[PDB]
């Protein structure tokens, strides 16, 4: 019924929303990743805290931007490597649970402003259409229904601006959306959604890429009342 992304995932959202083309989205994400590799590499890291925006902001030292607000108690920050080091040492002294990500850059920060020109030169003004699938973005926290809006500048801003993930989740809950299925090889964000509504399903699992995990996934989907085209999996056979 609706499609929501998160950072690069939003690209796939476009690729499935019908507003873009498969080749268009593939090329755009390829050029975005290539630019990030060429420039952003070796320049920072991501740190997550199991706290809200208020708690993180109240003790954030200079040199750190809030990367994303995943909810009332899940906030991730991106910035310079050593500024994040000082911040994590401070919180370690405070004892608040935190985590680091093995990343050599910082997204959704001022660093994105370094290669806006390069992003424009790569490709801009892609033929964005009206998405066939009603697509709710997180950059604007609002559905986009108009052709041409999803331009290269839009992707630059998406890489540049933050994520109001938790607020978007609450809004979708208020919009009557209850079933939230995650398309990921590993459970990624089912926990915050469970804390929010308690009904979400992961697709696959790390080290569990077998068919059994997939079948179990569609089974859990079917149990909650959603119709499933089972007969495609199994062909006809003899009489029993």
């Amino acid at each position: 019924d609706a499609v929501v992304g998160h950072s690069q995932g939003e690209i796939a959202a476009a690729c499935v929303s019908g507003a873009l083309s498969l080749e268009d989205a593939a090329k755009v994400v390829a050029l975005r990743s290539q630019a990030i590799a060429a420039e952003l590499s070796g320049r920072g890291g991501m740190a997550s805290v199991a706290l809200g925006e208020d708690d993180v902001v109240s003790r954030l030292v200079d040199g750190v931007e809030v990367a994303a607000v995943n909810g009332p108690s899940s906030v991730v920050i991106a910035g310079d490597a050593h500024a994040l080091d000082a911040t994590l040492e401070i919180l370690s002294g405070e004892g608040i649970r935190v985590r680091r990500v093995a990343v050599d850059y910082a997204s959704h920060t001022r660093h994105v402003e370094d290669i806006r020109d390069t992003l424009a030169e790569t490709l801009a003004g892609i033929s964005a259409q009206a998405p066939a699938v009603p697509f709710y973005s997180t950059v604007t926290s609002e559905w986009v229904r108009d052709a041409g809006v999803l331009d290269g500048g839009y992707w630059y801003r998406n890489l540049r601006n933050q994520v109001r993930f938790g607020a978007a989740a609450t809004a979708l809950l208020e919009q009557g959306h209850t079933v939230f299925v995650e398309v990921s090889a590993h459970p990624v964000t089912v926990q915050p959604l469970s804390e929010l509504t308690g009904d979400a399903i992961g697709t696959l699992r790390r080290e569990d890429g077998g068919l059994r995990r997939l079948l179990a996934s569609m089974g859990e989907l079917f149990v909650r009342g959603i119709d499933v085209d089972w007969t495609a999996m199994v062909p006809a056979a003899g009489w029993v």
Binding site: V190, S194, E195, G198, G202
Partner: protein
């Protein structure tokens, strides 16, 4: 609330496939037994169905001690 604690331990054991209530000591924390978020949600569903009360999926982090969760369910 002894019956409540026994039922909680048995339900958690069946969620994780353990032998029974004894196999999961009440003194052990929920995370120590090997519970994870989805499994915690499954135990939330189990306990909510068992008692009929409105139970949040995130109570496991608030009361990692099974006796604490049982006493909360008592009230």
């Amino acid at each position: 609330a002894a019956a409540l604690l026994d039922l909680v331990r048995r339900h958690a054991a069946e969620v994780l496939g353990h032998s029974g209530a004894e196999s999961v000591h009440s003194g052990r924390t929920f995370k120590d037994a090997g519970f994870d978020s989805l499994t915690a949600v499954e135990l939330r569903n189990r306990l909510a169905a068992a008692t009929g009360l409105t139970l949040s999926p995130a109570m496991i982090f608030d009361y990692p001690k099974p006796p604490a969760l049982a006493d909360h369910l008592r009230a």
